[PDB]
Amino acid sequence: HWGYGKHNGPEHWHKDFPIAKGERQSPVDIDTHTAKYDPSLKPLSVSYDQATSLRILNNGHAFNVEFDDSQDKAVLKGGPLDGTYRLIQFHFHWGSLDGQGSEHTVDKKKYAAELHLVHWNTKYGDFGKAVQQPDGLAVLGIFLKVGSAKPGLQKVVDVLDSIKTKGKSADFTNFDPRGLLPESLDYWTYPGSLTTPPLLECVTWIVLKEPISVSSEQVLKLRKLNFNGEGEPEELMVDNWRPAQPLKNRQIKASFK
Ligand SMILES: [Zn+2]
């Protein structure tokens, strides 16, 4: 099956998922000089006050912090979006070294990691139906650089020992994702895809310009996770990122000058 190893990594995905070579694949490099300010974009509305986190799961490719999305409790609206998108989960992509890990790049710069807050359009009723639509998902992408610790991340990294291996989950209630946001909500936006198989072309990407800082100790804990299941040979969960894909016939818009 697909993964991030030498024999099943991103360069292989197209054989099972031909859309890997499609017209609106993600991630992409964000060329900051070519992105155009779009004054008709609205401010982003991130309403996470009533967020209900439930569980954290190691799925063998990352870990997902999952939310109750059966009501409008944590939603993303505004910006490039029409309508209301419900938060279903967040997860990260990260490197084996601080010089790599992010999926999007900025003028070819790779960050140490990248956070994806995944939301689905409520007009499609459930996530499974949403991913079959060109405007089905909105993913808020946030870069991580290594420096000072992020207090709001610590509760996440401290539970990781309990979900070290594929298929393990743990209760993860009362987590506030507002603690993972940078100060500014300035962003770039473009139409793209899921960055893991099935690579569906259903995402409006909103990538924040301001990275968050996390500590070296925090990133070290990410790198202790395992891709493998319990009782299997240890393969560290690192470099679970897809590299930049061709922009093709797309324009990246900026919310700011
Ligand atoms: Zn992701």
Side-chain angles (χ1 to χ4, degrees), residues 148-154 179-183 212-215 218:
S148 66
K150 191 70 169 177
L153 180 61
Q154 191 59 32
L180 300 176
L181 305 173
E183 171 190 326
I212 60 167
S213 288
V214 303
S215 68
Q218 290 181 322

Side-chain angles (χ1 to χ4, degrees), residues 173-234:
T173 54
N174 302 289
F175 178 79
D176 188 350
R178 294 177 294 189
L180 300 176
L181 305 173
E183 171 190 326
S184 180
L185 297 181
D186 288 346
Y187 64 87
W188 298 283
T189 184
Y190 76 96
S193 75
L194 310 179
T195 70
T196 50
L199 300 170
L200 296 172
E201 292 180 334
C202 63
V203 180
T204 301
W205 274 98
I206 302 169
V207 176
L208 297 188
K209 170 172 54 66
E210 186 187 326
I212 60 167
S213 288
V214 303
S215 68
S216 60
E217 294 89 356
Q218 290 181 322
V219 178
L220 291 169
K221 289 189 142 82
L222 296 176
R223 300 179 183 145
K224 290 176 57 161
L225 286 161
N226 280 189
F227 284 127
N228 54 281
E230 181 183 11
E232 299 177 356
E234 185 175 44

Side-chain angles (χ1 to χ4, degrees), residues 91 93 103 116 195:
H91 61 271
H93 304 268
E103 294 205 308
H116 289 161
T195 70

Side-chain angles (χ1 to χ4, degrees), residues 71-129:
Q71 292 187 268
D72 281 353
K73 289 175 164 188
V75 300
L76 184 64
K77 306 178 70 182
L81 306 171
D82 177 37
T84 297
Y85 292 68
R86 281 186 196 162
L87 182 64
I88 178 170
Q89 49 97 343
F90 71 77
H91 61 271
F92 304 81
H93 304 268
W94 63 91
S96 57
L97 306 160
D98 300 351
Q100 66 200 49
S102 68
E103 294 205 308
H104 292 90
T105 53
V106 178
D107 296 330
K108 301 291 179 92
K109 176 192 170 68
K110 292 170 168 95
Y111 286 90
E114 187 174 327
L115 161 64
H116 289 161
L117 295 123
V118 178
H119 312 70
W120 56 273
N121 194 328
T122 60
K123 72 188 49 178
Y124 300 126
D126 65 59
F127 178 87
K129 279 281 204 303

